[PDB]
PDB file of C-alpha atoms in Angstrom:
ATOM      1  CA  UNK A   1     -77.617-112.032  50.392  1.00  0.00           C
ATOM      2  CA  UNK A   2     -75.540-110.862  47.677  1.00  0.00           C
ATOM      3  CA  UNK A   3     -74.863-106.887  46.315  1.00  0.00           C
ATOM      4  CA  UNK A   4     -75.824-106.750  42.697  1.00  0.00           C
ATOM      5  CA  UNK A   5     -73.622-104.493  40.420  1.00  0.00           C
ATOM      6  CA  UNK A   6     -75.818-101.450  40.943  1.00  0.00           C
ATOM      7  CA  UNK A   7     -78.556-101.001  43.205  1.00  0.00           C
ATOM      8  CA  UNK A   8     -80.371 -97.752  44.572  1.00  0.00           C
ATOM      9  CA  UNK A   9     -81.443 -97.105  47.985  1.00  0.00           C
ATOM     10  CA  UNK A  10     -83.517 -94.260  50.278  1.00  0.00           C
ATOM     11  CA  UNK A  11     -82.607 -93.298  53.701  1.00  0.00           C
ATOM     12  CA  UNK A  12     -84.543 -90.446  55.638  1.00  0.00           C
ATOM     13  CA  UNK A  13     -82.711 -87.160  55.798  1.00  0.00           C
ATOM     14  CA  UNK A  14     -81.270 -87.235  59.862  1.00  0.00           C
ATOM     15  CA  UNK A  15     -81.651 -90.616  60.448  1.00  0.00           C
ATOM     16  CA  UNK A  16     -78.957 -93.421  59.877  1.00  0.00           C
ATOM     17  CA  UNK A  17     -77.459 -94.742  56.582  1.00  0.00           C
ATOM     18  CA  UNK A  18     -76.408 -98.289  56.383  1.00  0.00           C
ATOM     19  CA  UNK A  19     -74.078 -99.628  53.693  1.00  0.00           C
ATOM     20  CA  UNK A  20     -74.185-103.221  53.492  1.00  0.00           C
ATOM     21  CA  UNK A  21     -71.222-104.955  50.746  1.00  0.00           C
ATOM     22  CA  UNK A  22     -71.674-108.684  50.687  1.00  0.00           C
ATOM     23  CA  UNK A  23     -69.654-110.678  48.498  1.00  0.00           C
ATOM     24  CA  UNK A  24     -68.330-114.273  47.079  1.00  0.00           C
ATOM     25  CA  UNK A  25     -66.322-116.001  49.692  1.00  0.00           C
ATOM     26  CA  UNK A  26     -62.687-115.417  48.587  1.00  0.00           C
ATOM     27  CA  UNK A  27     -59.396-116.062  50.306  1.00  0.00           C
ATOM     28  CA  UNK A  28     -57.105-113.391  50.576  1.00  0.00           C
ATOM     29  CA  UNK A  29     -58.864-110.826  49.381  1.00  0.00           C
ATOM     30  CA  UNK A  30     -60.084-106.974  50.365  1.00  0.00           C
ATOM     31  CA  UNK A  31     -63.240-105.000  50.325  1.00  0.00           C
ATOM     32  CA  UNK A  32     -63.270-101.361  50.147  1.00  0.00           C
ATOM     33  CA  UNK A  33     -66.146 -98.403  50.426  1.00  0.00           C
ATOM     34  CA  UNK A  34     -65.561 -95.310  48.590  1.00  0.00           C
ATOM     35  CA  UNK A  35     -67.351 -91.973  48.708  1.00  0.00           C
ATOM     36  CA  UNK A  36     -69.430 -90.562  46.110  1.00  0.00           C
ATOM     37  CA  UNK A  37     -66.680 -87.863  45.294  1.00  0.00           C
ATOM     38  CA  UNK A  38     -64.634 -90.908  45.132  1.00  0.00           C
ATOM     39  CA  UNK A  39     -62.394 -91.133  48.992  1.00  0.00           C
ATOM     40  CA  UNK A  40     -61.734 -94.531  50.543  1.00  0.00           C
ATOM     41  CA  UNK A  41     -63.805 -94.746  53.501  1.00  0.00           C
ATOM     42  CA  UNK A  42     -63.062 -98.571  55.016  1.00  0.00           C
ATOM     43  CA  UNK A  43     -60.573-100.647  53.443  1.00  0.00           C
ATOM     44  CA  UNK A  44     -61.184-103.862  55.523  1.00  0.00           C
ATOM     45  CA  UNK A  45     -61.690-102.906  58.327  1.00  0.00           C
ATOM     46  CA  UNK A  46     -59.308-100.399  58.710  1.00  0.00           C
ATOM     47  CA  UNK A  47     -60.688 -96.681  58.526  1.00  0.00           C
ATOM     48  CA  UNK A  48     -58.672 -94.491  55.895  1.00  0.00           C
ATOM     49  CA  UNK A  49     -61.004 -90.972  55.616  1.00  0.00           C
ATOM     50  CA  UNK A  50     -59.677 -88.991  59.004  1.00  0.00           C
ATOM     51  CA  UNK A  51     -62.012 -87.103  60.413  1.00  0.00           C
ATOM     52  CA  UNK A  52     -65.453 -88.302  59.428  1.00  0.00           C
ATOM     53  CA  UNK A  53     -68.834 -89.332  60.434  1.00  0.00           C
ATOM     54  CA  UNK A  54     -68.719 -93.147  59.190  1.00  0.00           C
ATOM     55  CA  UNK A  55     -68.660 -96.055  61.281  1.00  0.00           C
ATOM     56  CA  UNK A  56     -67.418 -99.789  60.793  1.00  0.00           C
ATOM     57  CA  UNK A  57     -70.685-101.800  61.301  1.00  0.00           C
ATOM     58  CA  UNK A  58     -69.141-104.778  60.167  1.00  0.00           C
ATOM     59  CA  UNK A  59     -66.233-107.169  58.487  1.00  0.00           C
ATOM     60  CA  UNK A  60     -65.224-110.408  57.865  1.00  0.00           C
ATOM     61  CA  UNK A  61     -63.694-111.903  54.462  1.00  0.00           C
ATOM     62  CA  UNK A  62     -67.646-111.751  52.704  1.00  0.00           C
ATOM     63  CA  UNK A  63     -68.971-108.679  54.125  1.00  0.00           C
ATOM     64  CA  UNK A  64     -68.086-104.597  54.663  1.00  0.00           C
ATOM     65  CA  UNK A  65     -70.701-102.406  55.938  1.00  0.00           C
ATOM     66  CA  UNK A  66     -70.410 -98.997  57.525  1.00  0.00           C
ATOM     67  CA  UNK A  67     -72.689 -96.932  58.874  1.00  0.00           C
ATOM     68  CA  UNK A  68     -73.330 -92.816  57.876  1.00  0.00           C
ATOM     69  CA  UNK A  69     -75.481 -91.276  61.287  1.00  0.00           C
ATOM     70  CA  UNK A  70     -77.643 -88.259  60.577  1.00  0.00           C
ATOM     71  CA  UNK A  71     -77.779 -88.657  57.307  1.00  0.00           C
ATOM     72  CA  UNK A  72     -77.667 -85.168  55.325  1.00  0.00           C
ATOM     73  CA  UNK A  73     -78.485 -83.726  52.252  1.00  0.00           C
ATOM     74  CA  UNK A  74     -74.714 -83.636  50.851  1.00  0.00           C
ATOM     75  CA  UNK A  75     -74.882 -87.625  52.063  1.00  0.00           C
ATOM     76  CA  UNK A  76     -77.097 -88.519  48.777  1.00  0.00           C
ATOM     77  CA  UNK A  77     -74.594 -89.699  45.521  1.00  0.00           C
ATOM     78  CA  UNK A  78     -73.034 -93.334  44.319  1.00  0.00           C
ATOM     79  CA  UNK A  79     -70.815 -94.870  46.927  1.00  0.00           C
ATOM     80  CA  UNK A  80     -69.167 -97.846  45.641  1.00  0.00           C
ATOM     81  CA  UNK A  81     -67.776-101.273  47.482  1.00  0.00           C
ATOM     82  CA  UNK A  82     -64.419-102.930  46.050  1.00  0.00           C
ATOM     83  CA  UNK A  83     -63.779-106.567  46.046  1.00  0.00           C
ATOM     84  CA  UNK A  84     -60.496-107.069  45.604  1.00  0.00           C
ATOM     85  CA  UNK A  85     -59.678-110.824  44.456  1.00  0.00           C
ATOM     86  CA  UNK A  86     -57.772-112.038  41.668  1.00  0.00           C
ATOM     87  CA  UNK A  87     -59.954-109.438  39.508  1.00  0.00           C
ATOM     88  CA  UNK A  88     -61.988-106.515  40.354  1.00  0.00           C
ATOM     89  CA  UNK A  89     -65.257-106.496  41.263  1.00  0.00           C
ATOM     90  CA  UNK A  90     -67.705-103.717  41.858  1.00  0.00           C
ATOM     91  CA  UNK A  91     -70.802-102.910  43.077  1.00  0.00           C
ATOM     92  CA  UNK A  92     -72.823 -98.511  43.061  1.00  0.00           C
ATOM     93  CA  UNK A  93     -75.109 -97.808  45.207  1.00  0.00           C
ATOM     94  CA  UNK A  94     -76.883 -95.001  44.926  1.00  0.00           C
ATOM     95  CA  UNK A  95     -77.880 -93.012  47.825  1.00  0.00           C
ATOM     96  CA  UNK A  96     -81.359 -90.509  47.654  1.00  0.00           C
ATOM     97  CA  UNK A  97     -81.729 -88.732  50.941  1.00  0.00           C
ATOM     98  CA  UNK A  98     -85.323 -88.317  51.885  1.00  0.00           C
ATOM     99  CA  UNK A  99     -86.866 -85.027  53.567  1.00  0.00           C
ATOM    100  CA  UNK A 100     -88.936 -84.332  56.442  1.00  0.00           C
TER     101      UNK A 100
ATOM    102  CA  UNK B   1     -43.398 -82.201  45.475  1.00  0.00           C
ATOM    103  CA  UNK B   2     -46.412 -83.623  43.570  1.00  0.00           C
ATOM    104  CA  UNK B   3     -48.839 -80.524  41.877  1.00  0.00           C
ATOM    105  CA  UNK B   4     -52.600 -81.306  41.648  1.00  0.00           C
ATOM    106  CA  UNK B   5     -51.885 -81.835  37.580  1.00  0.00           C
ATOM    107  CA  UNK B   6     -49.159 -83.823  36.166  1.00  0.00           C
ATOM    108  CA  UNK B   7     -48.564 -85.107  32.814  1.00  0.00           C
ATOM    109  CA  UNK B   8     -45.149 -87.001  32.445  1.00  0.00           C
ATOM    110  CA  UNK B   9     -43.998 -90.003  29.633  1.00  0.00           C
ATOM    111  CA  UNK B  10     -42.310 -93.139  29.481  1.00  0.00           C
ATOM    112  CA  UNK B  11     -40.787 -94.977  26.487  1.00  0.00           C
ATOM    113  CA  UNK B  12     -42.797 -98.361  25.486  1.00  0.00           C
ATOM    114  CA  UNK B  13     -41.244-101.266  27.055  1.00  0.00           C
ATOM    115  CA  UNK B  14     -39.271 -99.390  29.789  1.00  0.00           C
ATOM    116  CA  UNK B  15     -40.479 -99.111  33.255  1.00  0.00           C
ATOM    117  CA  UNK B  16     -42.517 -96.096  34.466  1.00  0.00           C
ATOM    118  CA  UNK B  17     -42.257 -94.691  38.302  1.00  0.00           C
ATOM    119  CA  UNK B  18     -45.179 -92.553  39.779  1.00  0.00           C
ATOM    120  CA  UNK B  19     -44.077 -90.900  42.710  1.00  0.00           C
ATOM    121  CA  UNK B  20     -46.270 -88.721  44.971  1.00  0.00           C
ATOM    122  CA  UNK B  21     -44.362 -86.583  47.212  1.00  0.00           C
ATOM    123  CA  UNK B  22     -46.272 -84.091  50.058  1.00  0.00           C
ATOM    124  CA  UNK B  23     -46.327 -82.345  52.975  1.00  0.00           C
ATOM    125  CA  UNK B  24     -45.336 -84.050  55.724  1.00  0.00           C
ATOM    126  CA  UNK B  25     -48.496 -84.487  58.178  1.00  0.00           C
ATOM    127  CA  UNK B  26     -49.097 -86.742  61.238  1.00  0.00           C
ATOM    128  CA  UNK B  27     -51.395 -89.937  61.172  1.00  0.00           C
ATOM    129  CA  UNK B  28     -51.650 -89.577  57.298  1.00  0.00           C
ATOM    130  CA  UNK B  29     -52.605 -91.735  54.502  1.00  0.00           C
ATOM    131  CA  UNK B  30     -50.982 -92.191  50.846  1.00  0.00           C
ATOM    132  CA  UNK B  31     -52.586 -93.785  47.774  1.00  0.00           C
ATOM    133  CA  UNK B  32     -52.078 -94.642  44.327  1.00  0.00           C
ATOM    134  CA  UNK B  33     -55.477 -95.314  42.231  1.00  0.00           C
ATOM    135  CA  UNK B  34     -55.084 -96.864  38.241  1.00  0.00           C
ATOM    136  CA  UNK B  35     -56.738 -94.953  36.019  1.00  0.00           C
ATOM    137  CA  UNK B  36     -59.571 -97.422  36.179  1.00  0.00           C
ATOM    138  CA  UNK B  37     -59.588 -96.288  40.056  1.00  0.00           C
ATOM    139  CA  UNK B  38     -58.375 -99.213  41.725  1.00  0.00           C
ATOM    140  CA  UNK B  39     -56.120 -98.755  44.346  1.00  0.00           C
ATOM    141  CA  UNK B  40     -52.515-100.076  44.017  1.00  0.00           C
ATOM    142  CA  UNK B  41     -50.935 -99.402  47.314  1.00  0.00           C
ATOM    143  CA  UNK B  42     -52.165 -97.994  50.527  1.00  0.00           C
ATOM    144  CA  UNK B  43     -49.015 -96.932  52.565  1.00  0.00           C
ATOM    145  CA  UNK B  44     -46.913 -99.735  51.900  1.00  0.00           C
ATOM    146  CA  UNK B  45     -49.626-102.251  51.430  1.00  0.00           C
ATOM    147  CA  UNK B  46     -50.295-103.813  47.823  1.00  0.00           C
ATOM    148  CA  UNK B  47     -54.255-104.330  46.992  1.00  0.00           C
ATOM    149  CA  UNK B  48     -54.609-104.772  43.686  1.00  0.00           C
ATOM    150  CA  UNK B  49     -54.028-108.710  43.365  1.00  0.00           C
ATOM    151  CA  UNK B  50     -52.684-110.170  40.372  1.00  0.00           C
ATOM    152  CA  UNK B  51     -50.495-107.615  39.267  1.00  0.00           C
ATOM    153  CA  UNK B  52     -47.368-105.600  38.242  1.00  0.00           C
ATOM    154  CA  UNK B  53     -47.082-102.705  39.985  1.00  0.00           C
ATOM    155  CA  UNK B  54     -44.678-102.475  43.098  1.00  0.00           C
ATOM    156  CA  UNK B  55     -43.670-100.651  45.624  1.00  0.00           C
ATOM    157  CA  UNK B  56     -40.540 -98.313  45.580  1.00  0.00           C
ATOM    158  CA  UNK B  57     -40.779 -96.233  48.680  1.00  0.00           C
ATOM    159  CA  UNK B  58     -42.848 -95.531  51.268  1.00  0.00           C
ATOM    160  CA  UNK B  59     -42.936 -93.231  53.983  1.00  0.00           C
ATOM    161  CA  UNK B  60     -45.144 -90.074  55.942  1.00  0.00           C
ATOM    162  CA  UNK B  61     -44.744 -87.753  53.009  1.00  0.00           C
ATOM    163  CA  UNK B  62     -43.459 -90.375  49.716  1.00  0.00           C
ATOM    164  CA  UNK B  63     -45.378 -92.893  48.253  1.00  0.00           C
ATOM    165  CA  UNK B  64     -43.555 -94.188  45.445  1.00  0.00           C
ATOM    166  CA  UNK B  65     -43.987 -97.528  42.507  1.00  0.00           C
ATOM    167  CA  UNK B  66     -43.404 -99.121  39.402  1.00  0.00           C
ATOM    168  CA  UNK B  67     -44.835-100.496  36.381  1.00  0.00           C
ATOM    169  CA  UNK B  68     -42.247-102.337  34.892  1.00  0.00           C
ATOM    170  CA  UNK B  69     -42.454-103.588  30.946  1.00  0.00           C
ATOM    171  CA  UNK B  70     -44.602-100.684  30.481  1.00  0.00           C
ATOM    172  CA  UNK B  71     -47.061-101.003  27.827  1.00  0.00           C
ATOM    173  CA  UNK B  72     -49.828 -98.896  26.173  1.00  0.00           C
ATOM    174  CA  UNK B  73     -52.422-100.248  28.461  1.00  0.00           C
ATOM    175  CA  UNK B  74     -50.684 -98.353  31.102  1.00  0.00           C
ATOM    176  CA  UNK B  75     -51.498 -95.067  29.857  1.00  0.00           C
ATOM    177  CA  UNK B  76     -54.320 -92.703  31.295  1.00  0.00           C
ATOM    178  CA  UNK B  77     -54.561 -90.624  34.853  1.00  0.00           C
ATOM    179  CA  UNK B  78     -53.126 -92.542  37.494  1.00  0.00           C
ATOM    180  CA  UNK B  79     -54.023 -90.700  40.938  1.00  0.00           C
ATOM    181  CA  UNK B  80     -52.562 -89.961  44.218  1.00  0.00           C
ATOM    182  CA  UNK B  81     -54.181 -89.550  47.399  1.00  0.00           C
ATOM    183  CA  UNK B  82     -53.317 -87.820  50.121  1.00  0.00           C
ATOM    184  CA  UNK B  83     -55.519 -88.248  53.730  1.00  0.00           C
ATOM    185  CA  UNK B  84     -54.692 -85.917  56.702  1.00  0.00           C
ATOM    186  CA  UNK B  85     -57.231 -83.742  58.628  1.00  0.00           C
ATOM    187  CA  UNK B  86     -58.271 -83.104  55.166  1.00  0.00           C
ATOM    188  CA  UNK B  87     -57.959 -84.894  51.567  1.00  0.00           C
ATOM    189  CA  UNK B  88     -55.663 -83.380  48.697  1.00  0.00           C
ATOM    190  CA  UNK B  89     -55.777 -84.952  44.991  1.00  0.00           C
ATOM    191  CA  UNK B  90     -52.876 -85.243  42.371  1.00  0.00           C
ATOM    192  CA  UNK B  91     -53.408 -86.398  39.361  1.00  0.00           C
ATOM    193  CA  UNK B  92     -50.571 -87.868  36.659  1.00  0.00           C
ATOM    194  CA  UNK B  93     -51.384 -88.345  32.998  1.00  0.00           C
ATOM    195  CA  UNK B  94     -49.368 -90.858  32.103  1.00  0.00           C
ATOM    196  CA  UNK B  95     -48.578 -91.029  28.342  1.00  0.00           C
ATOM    197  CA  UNK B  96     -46.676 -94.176  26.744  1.00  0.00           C
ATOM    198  CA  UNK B  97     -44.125 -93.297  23.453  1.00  0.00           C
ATOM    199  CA  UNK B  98     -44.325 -95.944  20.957  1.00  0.00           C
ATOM    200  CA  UNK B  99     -40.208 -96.143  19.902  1.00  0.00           C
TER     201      UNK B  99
END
């Protein structure tokens, strides 16, 4: 079901992240994950970032997620997911690592 | 060629032209963000709906647009990036004149 504006979520340090952007059905339109520090990662689902560690898990017109295997330390931070219709919408999640 | 700081101004009512201009690297990405960070073009591609901004040039180490009827709205860092093996940042503070 739906991503709310802001939401926080936990992943365990070394295993793997999964960012999950699910939307309004809307024609025409984009999604797009950026990177805490603020670098597209996905825009559909066409990889932008060159030379990095995230996968497409999935996308169609409601729905981006990606994927972030052995999840580290310097992974934790606010990604965020554009949806790109005739406005803006936008939706932070905030990443905590976990130890151990 | 683009610095990593920028400041440049455009009259009120005329139109404005951002251009980001780089090294020239293979397989590489170009992007304009609004100061609100949404992104305007990637490459040559529009994705910001519903708006005024278009495309002037594009190609491996140019990304250039527009805001025509330029308006005080349209003020604030705009920002290029730049995607190769590794990422590189400009950013242009755009300031509007009144008259």
């Amino acid at each position: 079901s739906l991503t709310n504006h802001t939401e926080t979520i936990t992943v365990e340090e070394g295993q793997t992240l999964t960012l999950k952007c699910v939307t309004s059905l809307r024609k025409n339109s984009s999604l797009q994950w950026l990177t805490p520090s603020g670098f597209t990662i996905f825009l559909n689902e066409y990889p932008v970032l060159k030379n990095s560690k995230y996968q497409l898990l999935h996308h169609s017109a409601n729905q981006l997620s990606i994927t972030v295997p052995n999840v580290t330390l310097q992974d934790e931070g606010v990604y965020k997911c554009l949806h790109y219709s005739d406005s803006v919408s936008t939706k932070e999640v905030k990443v905590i690592v976990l130890a151990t």
